[PDB]
Chain length 475, copies 4
């Protein structure tokens, strides 16, 4: 028996679990053949995956380097200390002014850990409204229900876009903050295509004596490469995912000011008071054992973030998105805020006479992965009028500007098919659209042809994290 | 561009030799040590290959067939398969039980259950942390709320019977009458006996409280059917997917669904756990699922069904029984006098030395254990015991006579710690550490014992990697 | 028109509102002719009533003496300062160790103001369970509902009697407090016939670092007279009503420690930190303008509480209750805890085969005013009757008179048992129907009512003149 | 026989007059009677209570414990207390012309501030959201209040509050900004209630915002309830879900409070189901057993008396005179060069913005008080801090109760103006510019002290000519 469970523990995935091996092979082929346009997605490196898939997973290491509860952590401590050092270096941070926690398991709990560290239950948070481009982990409630648990345990109130311009209305944010008295203001967005006015947020936070939290998950790779302005110039605390544009493993980091803050009226120094509170909220407050395999892969990703090739990549992300936006506009699409200054665009489909749910169904069938998105002017939250698309993932595969001009063309062809399906549907409900989409032989053929166009275009580019020659599903 | 694509596809050895070397050092450490921390295990190569796969690249907020992002055909296959195998691993009828496989680890899994089923500041009871509980069930000292569970909810501990070392269920029941908990946790970390799940169920019924079983430490024993199952009684069951399950680092949340018992049907006839728990996980508290972990979890759960896995968990139990017997015969006192599971709790009081001193010597001779509070301790900062268990070394093929050897080397390390204390000048721990580092004679004793430990441990297979390709073979 | 509203403003109640004047005359007759046994009730002095019914009501005086928001408060300040100083004197308190707030409007908000001052929302309070003798203003919840809003805004947990002895189970209180970690423990009761073990509460509060709040509303006049042990030796804060056994106007006082508390391990003085928090919770926290007419009447009541005849009154309250208890016991009644050490008794009627609701209905019809009370096994109708001596002692009832009160109570119970036996159904509404329709039992109740009224009528009226009453028959 | 002598002594003590028992307290009351005879009482929340109300408040109704509600008590003896509370409820609905099938009332709340807290406790969970007029803009502490330093009102501790504000360019509530703020803040309850505000509420607009937000509309009419009862201004009951009020202030009753609430059908929803109002049981249970204990039956009985008075033609004539006096007061102030916040008044008070006179409200209030004119400093738009108020608040209810008519309030404005001129002389004679230098000059300048002495004598000689309210001049201890 004992020889038999040892053989099981050392066998390959192919031998032990052909069903799971097959699923992974199908997903590899999907990442080879598709336009991956979800702006939060990316393709991580082989070296990160090998670290995440390593025996670093086996160790329990509650606590912090040199201050653990378990023994045996000499090399786990090396990895976590190396990760912290590289995290500060990736954002060009002075370690006497900034510290970092690398144990938070993902972006959503990272924000909750900051709130738990710095706010009592039911204290007040302001953030960008979710339908205006915010994120659930900053709070969200509808008329009838608290949707994010941040809005259960803390008191949240949104700030909004200027409806005319599509940019954050900073004047209204400031006026709202006078009345609401937030103890923390979030400067961070998901579906927002413009740069944050961090200086203005800093002025509001100073006036309100509120914590300035920058949540840079969508843009952290752009920040690390220095191709957009840094929130670290202004923020008190910065959270981020380690995946998305950073191109690391799935995880998170929390950065915070430390050391001298200012001098009081009595000539006494006043120190920042974030580090101990945040580290203790992460552990023992809310998490248990760190995921050392992820932390080890994060250290790899943060070293990669320093290279000239990584900066060239992020510069290309920006140039690709600008050309993508330009081409969409030329083809008659409307963009929220009229364009982009970062890695994504927000298409408002209202002028085309069709909603994002119908378009996204066609996109899925032609192997264009995007996501439907609420846009300003939407009546129902469950009928999004927009589509969110971005450049990090396909830029990682080597798409350049002319390639994203073609992506915009193929998107437009998919919208035109969607409009044809709608024109052929009897009813106006989405189930009538879907039934037409699955019974109309002419339009099925058009979708099949566009699918082949998309796959033929995407397949020519390199695969990231695996080699084409050993793919099980080449056809 | 050809340049950055090349860096994305290069091996770890080429891209990051410093990190590669840390992993090689850790491989050698797992080869050469007695790993006795009862929450640790060695995961299979196949799980690691799934966790290290391109499944990590996908955003898939929502649930299978109810996503917000496109492109999730195959991620849906993996999550659906994972759920199916999770119910199968614990022999659960899918018309009566559901599962959420997206919770990132054991501690947030419990918080997500509380968020789903309790309003802020509602009341939870659970085993006291120094009595064998866990921080994710709440914990407050005289001066500070330590777990944020005790910040957002109102917690109260239940305790051991100090004379027997078992949970004092009579006191729990009386305490609950006054405190009126909305949820009672049946789950422990440093506890060597089986839970009286039937008694917890009786108390929860009387109190109209949710019965949450947190089986993180024992879930692999449960899956193999070698100890009684909390699913016989509980409303909700949380677990880590690592520890005795031997899966990736992650968590599962199981919950009753469908029709309630005849005598519990009222305004609603159906259980009201599934939607609340799934919604607390997403959109409540998490974002994108970690599909690489979910896929590795599917692999681990298939392994959990096999006869080899049942043989493994049988061996875990028989090893721990033998380990306990050998320790008792060498004079060690065990909390509750023995074990019924994967771990033992040594109370070092009868030896005249505390757990902090012994653990330092153990660490120096490559034996990984944990200092542990024992009934009778005056301070939670000065633990009088040591916790040790059998899952990790049993995975490497240790059997009963091997754990007799483990107990022998543990005993020799305690004898060395007692000598360091005798040679120590002062009474404080820094004087002990000063002796432990400066005494040439005792430094030699620890070196010799470290060699004995490593020579014994090296004879066994490495788990999840090959000896032949290790960088550090000495 | 001007002369028209001036006349209305200066006219007597008899001229302006004959209906209200008649209600008051009916109530005077009720207080003259009955056995008023509700232990929280008393008869207030004429001088207090004259102050409460004075033009002191007109001034707005938010803030505190010498620190008001509005002008014109010179004489309001004289009254409130005098009230405060007399309040400390009434309990023989050192004003360097004790302060007082006299603005709280009644006993229930006084406790809420203390919690608001000293505890954050959702922090923990222990107090005597309401059906075990506690009070709603210390918190209370059933299995299904939070009844007191104290239990909404704060996290409450009860302590209970030893139901074998009827005394508070201090052993279980102490063990519960270890697990529950209260920030504040209340030592105060309503339906409880025994003295509190304040020293034991102090020991538990010291161990838990909890605020010790004594709520002496039921017993404060006994404390003021020095005829039972004082909670002020032990407590951090003391709340009380100003009515009930103190015999003042309807209102409340909050007392708190101030000044030096102890020396810490570092040789540093640590001061009490209750005074500013409590004063600020009362105003601007939770109340607005003080009721200066009530505060002025309170000053009058506190002067009375100093006098020798007030002490003689409270000593008589105790002796009357002891005799009442002894007589009930001799007539075969069981008392919760077996007797009394204060102003009330708790009769457990279960050994007589009838409940408190049925008995209280008969008592009401024979002009005996009493309260009901739960006993072991209850909740449905309560099994007990609560009766006390402060009100009738104020009218001059002495020991032989309360022996008579116990006789007439016993006669009422015997009538209630006859109604129960004649009632051919088992429901309370069947009892009421029999009680209202049975001519013979109505005759027995009329006779006992006449006996009660004839006995009570001979004692002085308190606060008004018999000779000028409208209803002299 | 010492025991019988003691018993006779304590009975004698209980039946003796205040003059006999406590001459020190009796003396204080006599001083306060003289003070109420001699002053210009312009604080708009103050009034003079009738003798009949005071006689009921000072009655043996105080002796009864009556927890619960009429006919639903917990213990005996309450036949006549029930008559009083039932009569009080009936008269409360009648005083505001309310249909008892559409409105109920609770008359047990002990004062205006706990009445509002009881409504919040009844209708909102802890930490749910309330909006109300900002305290420096005319609001009240019992609606919530927080500064940059700390939470001041405990309403802001137990509930989550946010203010709405005036349009400081017009002096009116900025309803547009209220509506926009409410969209973001999502209040569960909005208070329509003001103290230091010279205008009436746009209840129709508050109703529209509450309907859009599915929020409870609470009108807190403490300052105006007597005007409402007399029908001389529009009623909040046309629109509000719940109405709280003090029973003192312009109602001219005892110190206490009332809570009114809708009953019956709210709407038929989209599924065709009747939605009933759910206020009565929640509010009555928040008052008892939630937050209070034994009702104060002396106050409830005096409230019944005050509510009967509120229905009379003489009371309506009184409230009409309150409004006419305030308009005449405002005319005279404008004619003498004063600026009024919002440009005028629609009610019982005025808010004078003193900025164009070159002196602030603290300085003027101090001089007014020395000449026995009672008024209150008041924040005005443009003030540097809430601690340096630029205005002064004055009203007509109390002196109108003593029979001041329009020509008398023209005289009050003249004497106010004379006090302002003295304050300006004190400021021009002051060494420094801080308030303490003003107070120093005010207390040592023999000439200006003499001017204030003369003005005080003018004020008192004018006020003394009017009837005293609630007591007789002939029996006063202090007749000069
Ligand atoms: Cl996205
Ligand atoms: Cl462990
Ligand atoms: Cl009582
Ligand atoms: Cl006012």
């Amino acid at each position: 028996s004992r020889s038999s469970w040892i053989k099981q523990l050392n066998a390959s995935l192919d031998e032990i679990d052909p069903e799971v091996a097959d699923i992974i092979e199908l997903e590899k082929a999907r990442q080879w053949k598709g336009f991956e346009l979800i702006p939060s997605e990316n393709f991580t490196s082989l070296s990160v995956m090998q670290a995440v898939g390593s025996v670093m997973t086996n160790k329990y290491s509650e606590g912090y380097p040199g201050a653990r509860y378990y023994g045996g952590n000499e090399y786990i401590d090396m990895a976590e200390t190396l990760c912290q050092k590289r995290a500060l270096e990736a954002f060009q941070l002075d370690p006497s002014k900034w510290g970092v926690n690398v144990q938070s398991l993902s972006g959503s709990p990272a924000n909750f850990q900051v709130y738990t560290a710095l706010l009592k239950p039911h204290e007040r948070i302001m953030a960008l409204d979710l339908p205006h481009g915010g994120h659930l982990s900053h709070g969200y409630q509808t008329d009838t229900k608290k949707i994010s648990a941040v809005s259960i345990f803390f008191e949240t109130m949104p700030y909004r876009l200027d409806e005319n311009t599509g940019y954050i209305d900073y004047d209204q944010l400031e006026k709202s903050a006078v009345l609401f008295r937030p103890k923390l203001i979030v400067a961070g967005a998901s579906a927002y295509a413009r740069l944050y006015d961090y200086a203005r947020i800093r002025k509001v936070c100073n006036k309100q004596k509120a914590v300035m939290l920058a949540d840079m998950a969508h843009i952290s790779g752009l920040v690390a490469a220095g191709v957009i302005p840094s929130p670290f110039e202004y923020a008190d605390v910065v959270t981020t995912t380690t995946h998305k544009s950073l191109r690391g493993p799935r995880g998170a980091m929390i950065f915070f000011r430390k050391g001298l803050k200012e001098i009081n009226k009595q000539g006494k120094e006043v120190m920042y008071d974030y580090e101990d509170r945040i580290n203790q909220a992460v552990f023992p407050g809310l998490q248990g054992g760190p995921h050392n395999h992820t932390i080890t892969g994060l250290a790899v990703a943060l070293k990669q973030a320093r290279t000239p090739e990584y900066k060239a990549y992020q510069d290309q992300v920006l140039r690709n998105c600008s050309k993508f936006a330009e081409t969409l506009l030329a083809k008659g699409y409307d963009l929220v805020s009229g364009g982009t200054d970062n890695h994504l665009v927000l298409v408002n489909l209202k002028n085309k006479g069709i909603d994002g749910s119908r378009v996204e169904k066609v996109l899925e069938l032609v192997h264009i992965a995007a996501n439907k998105n609420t846009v300003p002017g939407d009546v129902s939250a469950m009928v999004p009028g927009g589509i969110r698309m971005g450049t990090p993932a396909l830029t990682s595969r080597g798409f350049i500007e002319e390639d994203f001009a073609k992506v915009a063309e193929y998107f437009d062809l998919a919208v035109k098919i969607a409009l044809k399906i709608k024109a052929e549907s009897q009813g106006t409900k989405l189930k009538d659209f879907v039934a037409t989409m699955q019974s109309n032989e002419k339009l099925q053929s058009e979708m099949s042809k566009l699918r082949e166009m998309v796959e033929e275009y995407a397949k020519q580019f390199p695969t990231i994290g695996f080699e084409k020659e050993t793919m099980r599903y080449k056809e």
